[PDB]
Amino acid sequence: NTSNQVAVLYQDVNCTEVPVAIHADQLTPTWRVYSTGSNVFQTRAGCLI
Amino acid sequence: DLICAQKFNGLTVLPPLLTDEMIAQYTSALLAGTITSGWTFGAGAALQI
Numbered sequence: 001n002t003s004n005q006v007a008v009l010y011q012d013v014n015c016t017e018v019p020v021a022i023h024a025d026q027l028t029p030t031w032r033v034y035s036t037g038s039n040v041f042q043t044r045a046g047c048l049i
Numbered sequence: 050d051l052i053c054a055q056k057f058n059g060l061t062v063l064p065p066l067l068t069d070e071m072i073a074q075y076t077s078a079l080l081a082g083t084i085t086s087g088w089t090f091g092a093g094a095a096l097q098i
């Protein structure tokens with residue numbers, strides 16, 4: 001109702017692993033850009049992109 | 050490890066929302082209201098005595 005943007009949390013995982021974790025070279029291009037950016041924040045719950 | 054055999058098989062553990070020093074901030078705001086206000090802070094605004 002408000003927007004179409006999303007954030008994605010990868011639970012209990014260090015984000016020095018995410019772009020090879022997500023199937024980046026073998027997926028849709030819209031799952032591709034939800035692996036990169038300057039918006040990468042490492043929490044205790046996981047990594048928030 | 051004890052936890053690594055569980056973690057390798059699909060069994061994860063999620064963290065609590067309030068950290069252990071947020072819960073300790075809550076109980077010190079309940080100590081400080083009882084000592085300085087009596088019982089009045091649980092029924093409205095805190096009145097000192």
Ligand SMILES: *[C@@H]1O[C@H](CO)[C@@H](O)[C@H](O)[C@H]1NC(C)=O
Nearest residue numbers: 012013014015016017042044
């Ligand atoms: C994630 O990787 C960084 C890179 O050195 C490391 O400092 C950090 O401790 C790691 N976190 C883990 C393994 O939970």
